[PDB]
Design a protein around this ligand. Structure first.
Ligand code: HEM
Length: 153
């Protein structure tokens, strides 16, 4: 469980992210796909992108980034009360997409890296600690659901 103070640090930097969701979405995707190329193989819709240049030019990838960050933003705003939001997300990623927990760790690392680069003033050590805790909470809960749904992860 996070304290209200930790949630405040998380929502304060997220408010900056919301000033440009599409842009943050792109940086995160490109960071992830370059650092862990294996994750790209999970998207039959994007697996054909070969360079950073092609990724940045993809309108579909941009749109998808917005969908993903909007869903994550909805979860963070719940401040730990996200049971309802996690069920459909867990079912699709465990049953249809088959995304192991390891990949959720990779995208978590990408989010922290992008926020550190674009918002140093609102992402000091304490804020990063709060965001890491919020993302670990998210992963822990998704993992528990995975098990209940019959997927190891
Ligand atoms: C921050 C964590 C994540 C969130 C909040 C999230 C959210 C979403 C949402 C909302 C969708 C569309 C609706 C749905 O299918 O449920 C989606 C689709 C998908 N996600 Fe995620 N996702 C996350 C992480 C990942 C990761 C790490 C991978 C793979 C390495 C992944 C793979 C997929 C795939 C393959 C689709 C289908 C894309 C398509 O063909 O249109 N997701 N995700």
């Amino acid at each position: 469980v996070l304290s209200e103070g930790e949630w405040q640090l998380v929502l304060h930097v997220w408010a900056k992210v919301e000033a440009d969701v599409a842009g943050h979405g792109q940086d995160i995707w490109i960071r992830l796909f370059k650092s862990h190329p294996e994750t790209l193989e999970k998207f039959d819709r994007f697996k054909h992108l070969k360079t950073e240049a092609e990724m940045k030019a993809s309108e579909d990838l941009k749109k998808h980034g917005v969908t993903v960050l909007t869903a994550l933003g909805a979860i963070l705003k719940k401040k730990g009360h996200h049971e309802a939001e996690l069920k459909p997300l867990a079912q699709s990623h465990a049953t249809k997409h088959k995304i192991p927990i390891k990949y959720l760790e990779f995208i978590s690392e990408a989010i922290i890296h992008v926020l550190h680069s674009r918002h140093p003033g609102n992402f000091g050590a304490d804020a990063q600690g709060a965001m890491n805790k919020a993302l670990e909470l998210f992963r822990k809960d998704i993992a528990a659901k995975y098990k209940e749904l019959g997927y190891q992860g």
